[PDB]
């Protein structure tokens, strides 16, 4: 069996290069090939370059030829991927795929596939402490028997981040929402909870942000 | 420029050629006579001495 | 013209920036305007082959002293073999052949100098 | 010659010359060196007082 | 300036992939004088028994050169059609004057192919193709490997039983995956060896279907043809740029066995070729029967002085670079191979410049172009001392009718720097030009 | 290159249902097809190999059918694992182009969307940026359409659309607008609402808050 | 003329023949203006100074290829950008017109090699033959 890990997910500027890092665990890694294929939106799955490690040669695609540079070490088998100019374009989640096939890299099937590692491009942003927008209790927020109230984290960089209410006490009704990019460039998401407003007046719902970056933990009233 | 730098170094090396000619034939003709000087020495340490 | 400058006495009427010495080379006075350095003219090291025809062993000799400041394959030294070049006890030269000189050994053999003879088993009798 | 390598190009047509001079030397400074072990020879080979 | 075969017509360019981490797995092949590797061989005269020291183009002994080896198709399993090319085309190199190249080193000798690392085919016989051109500039794609000037080209035909070399200036074509066609990655030459290599069958049309999809060869001024004898050694091709135009020289013809190199034939160019480029040759073929060829190795020719000894049979076997060693100086000497055990005086070393230290108000022109000019006989003289001078601008500011410099260099006099500047002006005649002189018999 | 096209984009079907996904192929691709199956938050798993032959560890019910241009994978019962990405690959050429991916909706339960609209907060204010948060709940249909009009006005670009990822026990969506202004154009405008229309609903219904 | 079009190899026996033929050449064009590249030179890419290239003997300058094989007119300038293997910078060739003449005067230069031993440039003429074992090798080259 062989097990394929990659790297934890990283954020490179532009202009610097990235390194993403796939590590295969049992089987045979020299005579298999691996393959790095990365999924971007609206782009779809597009494969960057193939490599064998006991051949130590590396297929690079031509349109990222010159730009990738694709190693594999025996002793840690692992295969390293360098990506160098970052752009928003370039930006997408990196796969490694092993074809199932030992060479023949121009028929490749993969059997197995990595978790993938996500790279984001940082022009002049730096972490710092999210700030979070409570929403409040009105009878337009009111709909009904149930008021939905939620805390907006915004102004955070790096890692998804743990959003909990009521220190993790309430679970039920809450809505995740993903990160979107600002004009600022740091990530801001929603937590609306909807729940009975005279359960709003019989408990104090706090809302807990933890920002893992900046190790800071913020909870206030919603 | 390169017509005359080609006709100064060809007289230059022509007249240098002449002196070691003339240095290696008076060299020869030296140790030609030290060569003879040697022989009178071995036969003064074989007499005098 | 390739020179190099130590301190020196001054010397000269000062009325000319150039001395010379007999010859069209330049003692080159007073390189420095503020003060005198005299010049030095190009300075370079010879090369002997000491080759054994049976043996098909050569080696690299130099004048008088290399042990001091010479070192083998030296940037500052443009040309050896004209391509590549060809550690030792000083003597006469730095001689790239090793294995040194013995106090005590066979008389006869190549001429090299006062004390070192060239054997051929790359070997230096004395 | 000069050291510019122009010049050595030009010294090789005359080279034939300038390795014959070499030669000639070469030989002078053997003669000296077989002169002078003749003469130390000469000189040893006689039985010494301390 | 006729063309053998028609122009834009067929297809468009194959697909061609580009890997270079395939390509240029590198065996080493340093050039030997002892084993006469390489050896231009005098021209002019024979000798037998004789050993003589002759100076002529020679490439330099130790020279590793430069490896370009040519790769099977793609080969899809249900197709062997799809072609890939190295970036030897993009691998242009200048050489001042000379080219040697070294053909079939390893022959018939276990190999794998480029296209797969993992399959392994035996070495086989093959012959080198490029395009040397005297000036080389971007493509409209903007990759390197664009020839204005006029290029010669040699392309094998018939799986290397035959050679072409024509005069054609090559002109880019608007077809995807060719030089003025968007999106087009390399240019270089395909084979096709069911018609082209049948058995008993050999196509010269081969050097035609490449023109036919990659570009289009204009002012085809010479069109030569010469047989290959492809017996399955293979020895040495040579090509010289003299004034005349370019020579063709082959090993095998002179004599196979030796590897001697003789000039076998000879095609006039009047312009002088500086750059050498290499067209990438790839023939497509099954996976089952691809071919691994060996590769040709190219070497810069330099003028050298070598020591050559010549056999009872008149053929060199054995050569000497004085250049490459003190003891190699010292045989070129004695012009004897074995020389007697001695210690010899050589070359001596010299040092090289390192910390530059330069010694150094600005002299004016103005009195020479300003008022009203004396006549020849009442010439006036201009002094400059104590200042720095640029002649550059002088020689811009006035077009020089006539320019005779005598004890100095034209371009010396600007750049020289001496005690003191003397300039002259007067008015001179055009029909007097010719009689004014530093010294004339007319007075 | 060849160019692989995935006919379906996104598909609907109850579980135990038939689902046939067409491949089209400029170039012919004899028997050179792969069919990954990609899982949110986890790699994509290998189906079938050549488009002719079940990979080993792939349930029975996915199949491969189909030749040259045209390829079709049949899935003869959905499950839950089943509503993923499909991706059908060329492996005919060196450079292989990904299928664009066809998803897999649960038709279990149909449910109308529920709109409500809540005020900034006071730190919002004093922030200096406003967000109105416009929220639609359990809507069946992935498809719908949310504009912002504001003193009867339409508001583009400064309104962003987030969705929550599927509940998985009604099939529905839960998806936040939220439009942002500047101070002094929060403060001038009196009226704001956001309108949706929506395919399971039977009427397009407006949220609407006046200022204060 | 001999410093940036035609210098003959001074190693080669060197011969210069100038001749007009009125009516024998009916067959050979006449070139509108007869041309020559009266300057050639090399622009260095900072501009500060410009390098004259002499042409080498018996050799196509790098200049030539960029004026057309007669010049439009006298006084004419051509310039390009060199590449970058070029080194940059700019190449500069001037070149001057002069009028056809009524009847076409062609120059020609003439180097006989004496190199070589493969082959023999003789005119033409048993006695020449070996059946004289006496005195005279006289052979192809060689007398």
């Known amino acids: 069996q062989v097990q394929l890990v990659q790297s934890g997910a990283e954020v490179k500027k532009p202009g610097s290069s990235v390194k993403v890092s796939c590590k295969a665990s049992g089987g045979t890694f020299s005579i298999y090939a691996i393959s790095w294929v990365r999924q971007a939106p609206g782009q779809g799955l597009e494969w960057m370059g193939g490599?064998?490690?006991?051949?130590?040669?590396?297929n690079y695609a031509q349109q990222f030829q010159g730009r990738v540079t694709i190693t594999a070490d025996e002793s840690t088998t692992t295969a390293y991927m360098e990506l160098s100019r970052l752009t928003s374009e370039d930006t997408a989640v990196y796969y490694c795929a092993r074809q199932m096939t030992a060479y023949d890299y121009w028929n490749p099937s993969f059997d197995y596939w990595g978790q993938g590692t996500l790279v984001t491009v940082s022009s002049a942003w730096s972490t710092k402490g999210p700030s979070v927008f409570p929403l409040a209790p009105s009878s337009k927020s009111t709909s009904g028997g149930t008021a939905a109230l939620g805390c907006l984290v915004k102004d955070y960089f790096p890692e998804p981040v743990t959003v909990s209410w009521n220190s993790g006490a309430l679970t039920s009704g809450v809505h995740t929402f993903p990160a979107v990019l600002q004009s600022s460039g740091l990530y801001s998401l929603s937590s609306v909870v909807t729940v009975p407003s005279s359960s709003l007046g019989t408990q104090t719902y706090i809302c807990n942000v933890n920002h893992k970056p900046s190790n800071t933990k913020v909870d206030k009233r919603v | 420029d390169v017509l005359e730098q080609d006709a100064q170094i060809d007289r230059l090396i022509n007249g240098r050629l002449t002196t070691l000619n003339a240095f290696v034939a008076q060299q020869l003709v030296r140790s030609e006579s030290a060569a003879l000087s040697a022989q009178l020495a071995k036969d003064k340490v074989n007499e005098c001495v | 013209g390739r020179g190099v400058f130590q301190n020196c006495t001054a010397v000269g009427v000062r009325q000319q920036r150039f001395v010379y010495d007999a010859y069209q080379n330049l003692v080159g006075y007073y390189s420095d305007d503020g003060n005198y350095y005299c010049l030095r003219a190009c300075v370079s090291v010879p090369v002997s082959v000491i080759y054994d025809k049976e043996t098909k062993t050569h080696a690299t000799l130099f004048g008088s002293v290399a042990c001091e400041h010479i070192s083998s394959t030296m940037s500052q030294y443009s040309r050896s073999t004209r391509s590549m070049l060809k550690p030792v006890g000083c003597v006469l030269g730095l001689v790239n052949s090793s294995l040194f000189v013995e106090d005590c050994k066979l008389p006869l053999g190549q001429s090299l100098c006062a004390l070192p003879d060239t054997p051929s088993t790359m070997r230096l009798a004395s | 010659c000069n050291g510019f390598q122009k010049c050595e190009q030009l010294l090789r047509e005359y080279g034939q010359f300038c390795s014959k001079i070499n030669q000639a030397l070469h030989g002078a400074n053997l003669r000296q060196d077989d002169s002078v072990r003749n003469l130390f020879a000469s000189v040893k080979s006689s039985q010494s007082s301390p | 300036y006729v063309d053998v075969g028609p122009d834009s017509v067929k297809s468009a360019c194959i697909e061609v992939d580009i890997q270079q981490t395939f390509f240029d797995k590198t065996w080493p092949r340093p050039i030997d004088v002892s084993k006469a590797d390489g050896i231009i061989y005098p021209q002019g005269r024979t000798y037998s028994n004789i050993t003589i020291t002759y100076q002529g183009l020679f490439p330099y002994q130790g020279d590793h050169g430069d490896m370009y080896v040519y790769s099977a198709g793609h080969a899809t399993g249900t197709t062997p059609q799809k072609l890939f090319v190295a970036n030897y085309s993009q691998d242009v190199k200048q050489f001042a004057n000379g080219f040697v190249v070294r053909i079939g080193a390893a022959a018939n000798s276990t190999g794998t192919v480029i296209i797969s690392p993992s399959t392994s085919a035996t070495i086989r016989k093959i012959y080198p193709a490029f395009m040397l051109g005297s000036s080389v500039g971007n493509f409209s794609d903007g990759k390197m490997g664009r020839f204005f000037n006029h290029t010669l080209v040699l392309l094998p035909d018939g799986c290397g039983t035959l050679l072409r070399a024509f005069y054609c200036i090559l002109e880019p074509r608007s077809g995807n995956h060719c030089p003025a066609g968007n999106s087009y990655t390399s240019f270089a030459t395909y084979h096709t060896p069911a018609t082209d290599c049948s058995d008993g069958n050999y196509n010269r049309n081969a050097s035609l279907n490449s023109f036919k999809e990659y570009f289009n060869l204009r002012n085809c001024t010479f069109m030569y043809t010469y047989n290959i004898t492809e017996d399955e050694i293979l020895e040495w091709f040579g090509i010289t740029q003299t004034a005349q135009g370019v020579h063709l020289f082959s090993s095998r013809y002179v004599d196979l066995y030796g590897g001697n190199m003789f000039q076998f034939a000879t095609l006039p160019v009047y312009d002088t070729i500086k750059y050498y480029s290499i067209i990438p040759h790839s023939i497509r073929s099954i996976q089952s029967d691809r071919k691994a060829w060996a590769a040709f190795y190219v070497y810069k020719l330099q003028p050298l002085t070598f020591l050559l000894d010549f056999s009872v049979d008149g053929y060199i076997r054995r050569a000497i670079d004085c250049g490459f060693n003190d003891l190699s100086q010292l045989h070129c000497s004695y012009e004897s191979f074995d020389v007697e055990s001695g210690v010899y005086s050589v070359s001596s070393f010299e040092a090289k410049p390192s910390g530059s230290v330069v010694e150094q108000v600005e002299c004016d022109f103005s009195p020479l172009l300003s008022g009203t000019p004396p006549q020849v006989y009442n010439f006036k003289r201009l002094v400059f001392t104590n200042c720095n001078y640029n002649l550059t601008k002088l020689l811009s500011l006035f077009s020089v009718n006539d320019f005779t410099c005598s004890q100095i260099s034209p371009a010396a006099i600007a750049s020289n720097c001496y005690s003191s500047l003397i300039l002259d002006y007067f008015s001179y005649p055009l029909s007097m030009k010719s009689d004014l002189s530093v010294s004339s018999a007319g007075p | 290159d060849i160019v692989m096209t995935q006919t379906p984009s996104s598909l609907s079907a109850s579980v135990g249902d038939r689902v046939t996904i067409t491949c089209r192929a400029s170039e012919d691709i004899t028997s050179y097809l792969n069919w990954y199956q990609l899982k949110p938050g986890k790699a994509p798993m290998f189906l079938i190999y050549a488009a002719s032959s079940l990979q080993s560890g792939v349930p029975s019910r996915f199949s491969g059918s189909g030749s040259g241009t045209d390829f079709t994978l049949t899935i003869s019962s959905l499950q839950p694992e089943d509503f993923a990405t499909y991706y059908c690959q060329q492996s005919y050429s060196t450079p292989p182009t990904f299928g664009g991916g066809t998803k897999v909706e649960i038709k279990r339960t149909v449910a109308a969307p529920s709109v409500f609209i809540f005020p900034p907060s006071d730190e919002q204010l004093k922030s200096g940026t406003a967000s109105v948060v416009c929220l639609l709940n359990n809507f069946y249909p992935r498809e719908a359409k949310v504009q912002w009009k504001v003193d009867n006005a339409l508001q583009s670009g400064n309104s962003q659309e987030s969705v929550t990822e599927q509940d998985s026990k009604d099939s529905t969506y839960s998806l936040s607008s939220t439009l942002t202004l500047s101070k002094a154009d929060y403060e001038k405008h009196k009226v704001y609402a956001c309108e949706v229309t929506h395919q399971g609903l039977s009427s397009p219904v407006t949220k609407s808050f006046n200022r204060g | 003329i001999s410093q940036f079009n035609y210098k003959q190899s001074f190693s080669n026996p060197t011969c210069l023949i100038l001749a007009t033929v009125p009516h024998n050449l009916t067959t050979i064009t006449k070139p509108l203006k007869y041309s020559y590249i009266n300057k050639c030179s090399r622009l260095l890419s900072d501009d500060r100074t410009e390098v004259p290239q002499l042409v080498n003997a018996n050799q196509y300058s790098p200049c030539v290829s960029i004026v057309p094989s007669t010049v439009w007119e006298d006084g004419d300038y051509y310039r390009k950008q060199l590449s970058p293997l070029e080194g940059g910078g700019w190449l500069v060739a001037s070149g001057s017109t002069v009028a056809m003449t009524e009847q076409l005067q062609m120059g020609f230069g003439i180097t006989v090699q004496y190199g070589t031993d493969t082959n023999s440039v003789c005119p033409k003429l048993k006695i020449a033959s070996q059946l004289g074992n006496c005195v005279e090798y006289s052979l192809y080259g060689v007398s």
């Open positions: 490599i064998i490690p006991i051949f130590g040669t590396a």
